[PDB]
Symmetry: D2
Subunit: 336 residues, 4 copies
């Protein structure tokens, strides 16, 4: 039994999540999943009703929860996601980039998984103005975090095509990246097909032939950049799912923001959200080993690819003229 904290959020969050509960229920039924969805408030509407973005009562329900399933948050996204990440130590940021039929009309065979270290590097904020016009920032990279991220890489590789590529820039940064690349090797080498690529080359190679990649393990920054590039190649950044996995707690969300310009027009695309749910199921299979959840993930992911291939009910963002309701219905019919 898993307990999932459901967050609607702002903008098109409420429309996307609330209308997706139909699919979330059809799957608990069809595959007999013991998932409890207890929803809580967080974001810009919670800051207006109460005084905090992450209300006291909400934090207490998330703490007793296994997984956090959220839609997009507004202006307060930084106080909700970041603070929630460092207290439940959700170090691994997973970013899949898979070709979607119809949207990728250039390659068609992209299947990348980017494992990105999300705790150190330059994104921890240790910077100062040391003198007039002079700013110094500290890049901190440890072998502890470097091995933990690698282990996650190994787990995803082992159930995919057994191929990992450690991406870095150790030719210039001998010490920092050199340490990251060494810890990469201690874990991966000899257990999977291993190779190393320089960050600039990988940025060029993603364009030339992204099918050469399976799993990519890289650092916080390099990963921030390569992820977005990869998603856009696979088709669209507005369709991209995201996850932040820790040892005892995980978080699944879409990459796209709250999108206030289209909020309420009933045309927001629920695809990113729904693919993050597919990952969430996959995470319930690593924690339970009960293949009951893996079946639900494949079923939801193939339902999505089928609607995109037919082109009969897509939202405006991807060239359709159907609503969010029509798209969800098409996925609900091909579910079983």
């Amino acid at each position: 039994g898993f307990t999932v904290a459901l967050i609607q959020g702002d903008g098109i969050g409420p429309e996307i999540v609330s209308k997706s509960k139909r699919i979330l229920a059809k799957i608990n039924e069809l595959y007999s999943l013991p998932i409890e969805y207890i929803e809580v408030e967080a974001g810009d509407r919670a800051l207006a009703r109460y005084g905090e973005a992450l209300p006291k009562d909400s934090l207490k329900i998330i703490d007793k929860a296994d997984i956090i399933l959220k839609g997009p948050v507004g202006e307060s996204a930084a106080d909700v996601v970041v603070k929630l990440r460092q207290i439940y130590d959700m170090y691994a940021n997973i970013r899949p980039a898979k070709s979607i039929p119809g949207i990728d009309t250039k390659y068609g065979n992209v299947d990348i998984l980017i494992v990105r270290e999300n705790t150190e590097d330059l994104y921890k904020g240790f910077e100062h103005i040391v003198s007039d016009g002079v700013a110094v920032g500290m890049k901190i990279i440890t072998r502890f975090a470097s091995e933990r991220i690698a282990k996650v890489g190994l787990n995803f590789a082992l159930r995919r095509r057994k191929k990992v590529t450690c991406v870095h820039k150790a030719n210039v940064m001998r010490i920092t990246d050199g340490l990251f690349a060494e810890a990469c090797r201690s874990v991966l080498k000899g257990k999977v097909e291993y190779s190393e690529m320089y960050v600039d080359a990988a940025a060029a190679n993603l364009v030339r032939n992204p099918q050469m990649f399976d799993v990519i393990v890289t650092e916080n920054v390099y990963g921030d950049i390569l992820s977005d590039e990869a998603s856009q190649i696979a088709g669209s950044l507005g369709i991209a799912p995201s996850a932040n996995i820790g040892d005892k707690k995980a978080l699944f969300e879409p990459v796209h923001g709250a999108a206030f310009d289209i909020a309420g027009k009933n045309i927001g695309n629920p695809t990113a959200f729904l693919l993050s749910v597919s990952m969430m199921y996959e995470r319930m299979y690593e924690l339970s080993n009960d293949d009951r959840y893996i079946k639900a993930s494949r079923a939801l992911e193939n339902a999505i690819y089928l609607v995109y291939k037919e082109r009969k009910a897509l939202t405006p963002d991807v060239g359709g003229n159907a609503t969010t309701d029509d798209l969800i219905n098409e996925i609900y019919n091909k579910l079983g």
Copy 2:
């Protein structure tokens, strides 16, 4: 006048460069260009003939020279280029990304100019191992280096589409990138169309629509990555020219390596090299204000564009079947 240190280099360097002298000579007399070319030896071949990769007699000549024109260098590339860039303070790294009609693009017509700070950031190698398994790098951003790179960005924009985009990550690095962006504004705001974009957005927008970009001004690291992504999108990395511009010294080279595997087969593509020469002429114009150099620049760029459009004598790297002598000849007929 101008004095140029010419370096043939290794692998395909000797073939490419020596055969391109015909072209370098025809232009000097066609546009009455006072350029003196004095070749020096450097690279792997010089390490085996003499004792050093960069002989004292070579350094003596490059010291009096205005511009450094070079072909690809072998294994000792990292000891030459980098050193010369530091002692002659060649801070601006120019990387154009321009599609050539003829070669496969699959992204449309792109005309992007990336201007990269090439002296500070994380690439100055200020990093150490502080404790067991703990490494620390220092990122340095200064007002000085940042205004200087923005001024170079302004020059190039002004004679292109007058559009600039500062790429950074000030949302997460408030102090370091924030100082970069502020320097970018005090120089560019008001003088050109100016916008700022986060590096991960840019990595993605470069794939979604690269035609939205004209001149990009960014940091050492971010520019290192985006440069290679932009060159692939436009065409190939083997067609890509490069430049390193200082106040009183400039260097022009192809991006491609020595390519020992095809050396001597007489098939190395001189395009990247000849486009470097074209950039050189562009820099001689800024220095002398004599538009003869700009006319020589357009004349050379044009000639290669015509031969590519005709597709009758291309090299095998771009789908042709002609020799490196045939392609140079076709550019020589389109010149006069």
Copy 3:
């Protein structure tokens, strides 16, 4: 005309300052000094009446004042002195160490002046925990601050024995202290008797023979340590005066704390306070060049040495049995 902001402070501050106004008035009279003493509240009693240690009304009266003359502050000393230093940029911390008759029974001829840089080094607080069990602190030293501190050194040397000693540790810290020692030389060398000493040697030399020193210019930390040592040798740390001089604003105070254990017993020693007033007068001679204030400084300083030599009315801290009132009276009689 000078306007001095008078602060009583806590503990023995109120007793020391308020009873010293007799001497402060006798000198304005005897030497016709145009000094306006307008007193303001700051410290632990101000935090109890109002809500801030440095009340809004107080800050506004200090801003229109030239010099700040304070007694000791209590628990809130860090929010009063430090914040007041960095907004009026009072970089130079002056610490004289002069033998007092009767208390120095070991050397008898100590006359040191320590000029201590008070803005950079390690005392600016740029430190983080980068990893588990690992802490990093940044030592930042600029040539700007290094030359400003040296210039102050030169001014004090020029009206004393024309002898300066730059103290550092550049043999180990080639870059940081090496830069400090270079900036020391640019200013001092060729204008005064110049020499360099290593910090550990100076710590030993102060004990062996402190008469070898006149003025000492050193960095924030080394100076924090050497100052206290020097004062204790000269006689007593509880007798030591202190100053923080800036370009447009100065601050004079005793080194000793509020001393709550003896507060109200009418036995606190006013000597430290009164010698800081002697420095304050000296500072009015650098800003006015009117030797009227220099006369008042020598007169107050000799009045103090005379009472210490006679031993008839000293406070318990230095072996007497007289009160703070009796000591002030003896100085008031030998004033004129």
Copy 4:
């Protein structure tokens, strides 16, 4: 048993050391000490005889040796001592300050033991010039190095007056020194009389009353300064012994240099050297747990104390008029 690499060194080194072998030999047979002395060449004299200051044949022997006993080294001191201290991880720098009855003290009887961390802090030389006239040093404090130095502090305290004082500056450096002090507490609190003192207070209290101190545990830099202050107070820097203790290698030397000005006059004082030997025996006791070494230590310390008390055969550096042979002889008669 123990094997000792003996190094005569330069200047007065050869005279002092060679004449002290008589003493080293008499003790080995008087207390049945299994110590093998194997002399190696190192210093300026070795740089002129052979080619290196620290010959390969010397390093070979020191590698198999347990303890390194050395006399003063000339100009090449910084290349030997420092290197050997880094590759054999000799982290604890012991600096006793003990008055000898006979020599001028002027501070009473002091018996201070300073234990200095000698591997991290600011002395690992992690500093760079980041911008024009701006230098940055990195101060590194670790939990590991700090507990290790506190354990060494505990050993020495336990066999002295069971009193320890952690010297630091955590009031201003909250993070760095704060971590040092915390490591100091978890090891010392409860096992000995434990207090903490700020470095500037200590510099002053060392002059006011040094008898309040027994064992001092501090950092690399603070201990560098206070060590020299404490040795002067106790007596002289030329009488001061020094030690550098690692887990599997230890080094013992005098603090004084080679003193070329008096070399050959047969007047160099062997006290510092012989007190180093005494410390060595103390370390052999901790390693073997055989009190024969401790008896040899007290026996040697005592003999020198008797000759100093009698004042009949002292060297000119301490007011005597005897030769370096006479003083060694008097210690040899007081031994048997």
